[PDB]
Structure 1
Amino acid sequence: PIKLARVTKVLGRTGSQGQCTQVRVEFMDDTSRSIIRNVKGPVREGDVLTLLESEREARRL
């Protein structure tokens, strides 16, 4: 299923050239839930991300 998540805190810049951004995201359906995600493109705190597959987690720096 497709899920929506809210960006709580921006963590850092990842990638070979720094193209990706590592952030912390909390699910809308369950406010207790929180994971770490890699986002492509400009992103700031409060943005809403559409997770097609919400089980994957990213290796934080």
Structure 2
Amino acid sequence: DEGYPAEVIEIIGRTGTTGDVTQVKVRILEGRDKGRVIRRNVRGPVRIGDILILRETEREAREIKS
């Protein structure tokens, strides 16, 4: 289990097909990219301060459009 915990700092807004998925912003608290800000996707309800687990830091979500 070489997972990378990271902390939710901001919610961009709902995205994805059903809108259930939420576009979030997360700060990498540990690993090789400590302190980096990443736009990422979340399934399930989210709050300001959730410790999202990452399989990779390489993936960054595409910018959502309106």
> TM-score, length-normalised on structure 2?
0.84
Equivalent residues, number: 60
- Write out the 4+ residue segments of structure 1 that deviate beyond 4 Å after TM superposition: none
Structure 1 unpaired stretches of 5+: none
Q: How does 1:1-61 map to 2 (within 5 A)?
A: 1-29=2-30, 30-31=34-35, 33-61=36-64
Structure 2 unpaired stretches of 5+: none
> TM-score, length-normalised on structure 1?
0.90
The structure that has the greater radius of gyration is 2
Aligned-pair identity (%): 50
AA matched with 2:8: V
